[PDB]
Amino acid sequence: TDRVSVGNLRIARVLYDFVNNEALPGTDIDPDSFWAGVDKVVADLTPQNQALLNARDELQAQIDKWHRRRVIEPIDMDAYRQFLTEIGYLLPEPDDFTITTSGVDAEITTTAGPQLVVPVLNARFALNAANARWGSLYDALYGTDVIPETDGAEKGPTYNKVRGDKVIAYARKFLDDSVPLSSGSFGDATGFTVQDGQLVVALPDKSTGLANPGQFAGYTGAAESPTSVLLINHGLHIEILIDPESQVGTTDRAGVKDVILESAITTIMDFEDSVAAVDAADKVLGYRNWLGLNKGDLAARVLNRDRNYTAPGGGQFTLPGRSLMFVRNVGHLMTNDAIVDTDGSEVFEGIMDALFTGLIAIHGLKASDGPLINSRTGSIYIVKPKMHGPAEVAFTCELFSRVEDVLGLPQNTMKIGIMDEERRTTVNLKACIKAAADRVVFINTGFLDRTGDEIHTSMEAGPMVRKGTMKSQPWILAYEDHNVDAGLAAGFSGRAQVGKGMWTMTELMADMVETKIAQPRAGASTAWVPSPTAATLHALHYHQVDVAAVQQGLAGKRRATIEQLLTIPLAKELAWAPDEIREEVDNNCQSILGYVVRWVDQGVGASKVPDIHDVALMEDRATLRISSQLLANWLRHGVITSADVRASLERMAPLVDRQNDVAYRPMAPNFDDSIAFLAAQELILSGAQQPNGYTEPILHRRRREFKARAAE
């Protein structure tokens, strides 16, 4: 064929060659021993992987039946709770404990700041994301709606000085709020100098230093007239660039050219919900980019070097120039035919990701032909998504342990960022953390997947509230607080990240700056952003909120009950008028179609899709999971008919065709000839039958179908 036999496995040649020629050289792992290890790990752990997936199905069957066999008024919470305990869904809560994870980098244990997620299959985006550790505040302010485009302040083809002056003024207020002067305001500064190791800021009438001189972290250039001044606040760096000859510095009262913020402290290179990878060719593209990131030679533009500074006293030092990288592996569900066994059965994809992304990450622990690219403390950081409960966490740990043995790595090298994005994890979160107590480096509320699981788990209970109502429902507010509580109770402060979820409105940056501050105010040491620009703007929130102090104030508090976590988001009687149902259907169909068409026809796993209100939303599989499950639920309970669904899909499809484009194939009017349209339809009409409402089985099948037809 086009496969390589190793034991019981038949490996796609493209993957075999990539591993031997690109991934293995430089790790000192023997190629034959590696492939024997792949065979042995797959054979040994596949049964447990399948058993865990079977357990999800059996628990969900019981829950479906339970709802179908009830007539009572609102749900008897006491009966529901004891039922879930009976079936093993709700497990006992373990005694208090503190995590023991060691060898973790400061960016994770100590620094509070933004965490950027990027599809690993897009080399250009991945490079920008790794370089997003530092970003221009002026560019982020000028280029977005944070500075309103009011009369006279609009963006044009050329620089608008009125707008630029608003940018400068915004940044000066940020400096006053973050690194205050002893007296006066940065808005009146006329220059900066370093005198006896102290920062001196010239005012019109006088000179002043910092109210806290310890916030002066360094400078570049001559101490007499530095080319830049480096400050620190809440552990994050701020750099004032001084250049009176620049276009902006010429207009500035102190010659300031820009303010650079330490922004994306860590970055998650994603193999999961933001990428479309359905075969060996796709996986190799992703693995090769992850390899180039860890070897430091990925080029599309290149990775940045570390940044050199002079210390206040005069010594030299350096700061990391790149975001510390995690990789998000796929979860336990899917198989991939990149490897098949002798029976033709596909191998579990999460098992493969652990082996291959783990192998590749070794390069980030060693010098790059300069210094090693990633973890100086010797860890490999893997986000494991979509786990359901503590036995599934234990399985990830065993998989990582077995992979470490194959790779010759110390035990516990491979650390786990746990997504809390499935109900059976939420309600057993303390036990999930305990199961990974020596590997865990974060917990994070993946609230979009979590909403998808909320809908599917209770699918039989009745019609759910509209998608937009979900973000304010009791269950989700309890879930967010419960996650923070569990992390802090497990000793996460100073040891691991407590993270919150993604901002998806990529153009609504004024709204992000106004509202996303709630996440660090809730004690999250990190939260997810969709772009380098949004990382720079979200960094402002960490200068305003002292997350370390917030976490200390939250200690010992139990702010969510199990009853709150289990409050199902059922709609009340007579909740909606016909126009509101119409808008919900059309909005969900447009978002489904806009995302699925680029997935199936172009293999793009994350797309900006305008919604029914013309708001650009960054869509990935989790937002698709919500929209498809909600419509499945409304169809299941008679809120809408199958004619309503088909009509909405047919009405929104031509609009999506218009929004798109070199490789774009219109879906309309030949709907049944478009694999993408049929995939969108199947996601709704078959949604109730998909395991835990997951979208990958349909998406993968339909993308492979598209590729097959295109190859003739």
Ligand X SMILES: Cc1ccc(C2CC2)cc1C(=O)/C=C(\O)C(=O)O
- Closest C-alpha among 609, 604, 608 to residue 706: 604
Q: Quickly list H helices, 217-374.
A: 280-295, 349-361
- Give the whole-angstrom CA distance, residue 429 versus residue 485: 10
Question: Which 100-159 positions form the footprint of ligand X (CB under 6 A)?
Answer: 117, 119
Answer with the entry of ligand X, Mg ion, none that 530 interacts with (C-beta below 5 to 8 A by kind): ligand X
Three-point CA angle 239, 242, 248, nearest 5°: 105
Indicate which single residue of 60, 111, 274, 375 sits in contact with ligand X (rule: CB under 6 A). Answer: 274
Nearest approach, Cβ of residue 547 and Mg ion (Å):
10
List Cα–Cα distances, 655 to 455, 586, 593, 604, in angstroms.
28, 11, 10, 19
Q: At 621, give phi and psi (nearest 5°).
A: -60, -30
State the CB neighbour count (10 A cutoff) for residue 100: 12
Nearest approach, Cβ of residue 52 and ligand X (Å):
20
Q: Helix, strand, coil % (nearest 5) of the chain?
A: 45, 15, 35
Q: Which of 270, 481, 620, 657 is catalytic?
A: 620
Q: b/e string for 332-363 if b means 16 or more Cβ within 10 A?
A: bbbbbbbbbbeeeeebbbbbbbbbbbbbbbbb
Nearest approach, Cβ of residue 593 and ligand X (Å):
17
Residue placing its CB nearer to ligand X in the complex, 524 or 622:
622
Q: Please state the length of the chain.
A: 712
Q: How many residues bind ligand X (CB under 6 A)?
A: 18
Q: Does 449 bind Mg ion (CB under 5 A)?
A: yes
Answer with the entry of Mg ion, ligand X, none that 623 interacts with (C-beta below 5 to 8 A by kind): ligand X
Looking at residue 173, its amino acid is: K
Nearest approach, Cβ of residue 232 and Mg ion (Å):
11
- Give the whole-angstrom CA distance, residue 326 versus residue 519: 21
List Cα–Cα distances, 665 to 107, 321, 595, 656, 672, in angstroms.
44, 41, 14, 11, 13
Q: Say which DSSP state 495 is in.
A: T
Three-point CA angle 240, 244, 246, nearest 5°: 90
Q: Which of 163, 288, 328, 424 is catalytic?
A: 328
Q: Does 273 bind ligand X (CB under 6 A)?
A: yes
Residue 139 makes CB contacts below 8 A (sequence gap 6+) with: 258, 533, 536
Answer with the entry of Mg ion, ligand X, none that 546 interacts with (C-beta below 5 to 8 A by kind): Mg ion
Answer with the entry of ligand X, Mg ion, none that 22 interacts with (C-beta below 5 to 8 A by kind): none
Residue placing its CB nearer to ligand X in the complex, 121 or 248:
121
Please tell me whether 446 is known to bind a ligand.
yes
Please tell me whether 301 is known to bind a ligand.
yes
Question: Which 525-544 positions form the footprint of ligand X (CB under 6 A)?
Answer: 530
The three-state secondary structure class of 57 is helix
Nearest approach, Cβ of residue 605 and ligand X (Å):
8
Q: Does 620 bind ligand X (CB under 6 A)?
A: yes
Mark whether 620 is an active-site residue: yes
**Residue pair 499/525 in contact by the 8 Å Cβ criterion:** yes
Looking at residue 120, its amino acid is: V
Q: Which stretch binds ligand X (CB under 6 A): 176-184, 248-256, 390-398, 617-625?
A: 617-625
Mark whether 39 is an active-site residue: no
Q: Which stretch binds ligand X (CB under 6 A): 11-19, 168-176, 619-627, 650-658?
A: 619-627
Nearest approach, Cβ of residue 623 and ligand X (Å):
5
Site track for ligand X across 431-450, x = CB under 6 A: ---------------xxxx-
Answer with the entry of ligand X, Mg ion, none that 262 interacts with (C-beta below 5 to 8 A by kind): none
Burial class, 157, CB count within 10 angstroms (exposed 0-12 / middle 13-18 / buried 19+): exposed
Nearest approach, Cβ of residue 452 and Mg ion (Å):
8
Q: Does 501 bind ligand X (CB under 6 A)?
A: yes
Please tell me whether 706 is known to bind a ligand.
no
Which residues are known to be catalytic? 328, 620
Which positions touch Mg ion (CB under 5 A)?
Answer: 421, 446, 449, 546, 622
Question: Where is the binding site, in residues?
Answer: 117, 124-125, 274, 301, 328, 421, 446-449, 530
Question: Can you say which residues are annotated as belonging to the binding site for glyoxylate?
Answer: 328, 421, 446-449
Contact residues for ligand X, defined by CB under 6 A = 117, 119, 273-274, 421, 446-449, 501-502, 504, 530, 606, 618, 620, 622-623
